Amino acid sequence: DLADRFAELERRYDARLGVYVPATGTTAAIEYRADERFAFCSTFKAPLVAAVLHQNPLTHLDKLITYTSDDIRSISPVAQQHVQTGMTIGQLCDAAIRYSDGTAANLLLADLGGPGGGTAAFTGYLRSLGDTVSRLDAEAPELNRDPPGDERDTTTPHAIALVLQQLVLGNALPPDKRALLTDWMARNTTGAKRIRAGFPADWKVIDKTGTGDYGRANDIAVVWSPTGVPYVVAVMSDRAGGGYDAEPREALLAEAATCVAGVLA
Numbered sequence: 001d002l003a004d005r006f007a008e009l010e011r012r013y014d015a016r017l018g019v020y021v022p023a024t025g026t027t028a029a030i031e032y033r034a035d036e037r038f039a040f041c042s043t044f045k046a047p048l049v050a051a052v053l054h055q056n057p058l059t060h061l062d063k064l065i066t067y068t069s070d071d072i073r074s075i076s077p078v079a080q081q082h083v084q085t086g087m088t089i090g091q092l093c094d095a096a097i098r099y100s101d102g103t104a105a106n107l108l109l110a111d112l113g114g115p116g117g118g119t120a121a122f123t124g125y126l127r128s129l130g131d132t133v134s135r136l137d138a139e140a141p142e143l144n145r146d147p148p149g150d151e152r153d154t155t156t157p158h159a160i161a162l163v164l165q166q167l168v169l170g171n172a173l174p175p176d177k178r179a180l181l182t183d184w185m186a187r188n189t190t191g192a193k194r195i196r197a198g199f200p201a202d203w204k205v206i207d208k209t210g211t212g213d214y215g216r217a218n219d220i221a222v223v224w225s226p227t228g229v230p231y232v233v234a235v236m237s238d239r240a241g242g243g244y245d246a247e248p249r250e251a252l253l254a255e256a257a258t259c260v261a262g263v264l265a
């Protein structure tokens, strides 16, 4: 029984686990704690890039953005290396998705603009996709740090799955922008030990991870069966019982995804 298996994983990892897979053709929705709030962590970067793409002509990707020492405030694998030269919006989108680059995400929030350094416009973009649940209140690093239970900077597995479904599978974006987002997620470098680890090699996986304090580890993905049937998979987790410095545990997400893949095969 799937709920029993997820509960077992919670005990194993001293964790809270949330899972959502939207209903399809012939599969019922898979849901476990799916309407409970979990921190976005870096998973917000996927709809953030969608927001920036949606808001601008495609060639806005070629605009150079400059930034300085005091902008580097978080893990930023790419932005730290290009600080002397600047990065185009396209490079920033690439880095935010594929390297979960915090500086890139903050610069993209600022590009979107408006109150809260772009966080209000980001939330407004989610509202436009019918998500009345999620909220972004802070940028990097702060957004990963809210105490367990705090609603700031949270989504739910259910809400983020429906958002990702519209972005990648639905018509939230025009085909050209949809393809840019899909390809960046397809080329993600940070997700090998999460949802990807739970699906057989002949299934395509594209994803965006998130990791935070209190043992937070998330992954949102679109997967395609060997025959081209797509599913959206959102797995979120925290280990609040270990306090702020609790280790995130990717293996929890890999096991949860393995359980999901078993049902979807």
Ligand SMILES: *C(=O)[C@@H](NC(=O)Cc1cccs1)[C@@H]1NC(C(=O)O)=C(COC(C)=O)CS1
Pocket (backbone or CB within 6 Å): 041, 042, 043, 074, 075, 100, 101, 102, 140, 141, 144, 190, 208, 209, 210, 211, 212, 213, 248
């Ligand atoms: C987004 O989740 C962001 N997280 C943080 O900046 C907070 C943390 C820093 C170290 C551990 S949590 C970036 N994204 C990811 C990710 O998986 O998407 C990170 C993953 O790190 C580990 C550990 O697996 C950290 S940086």
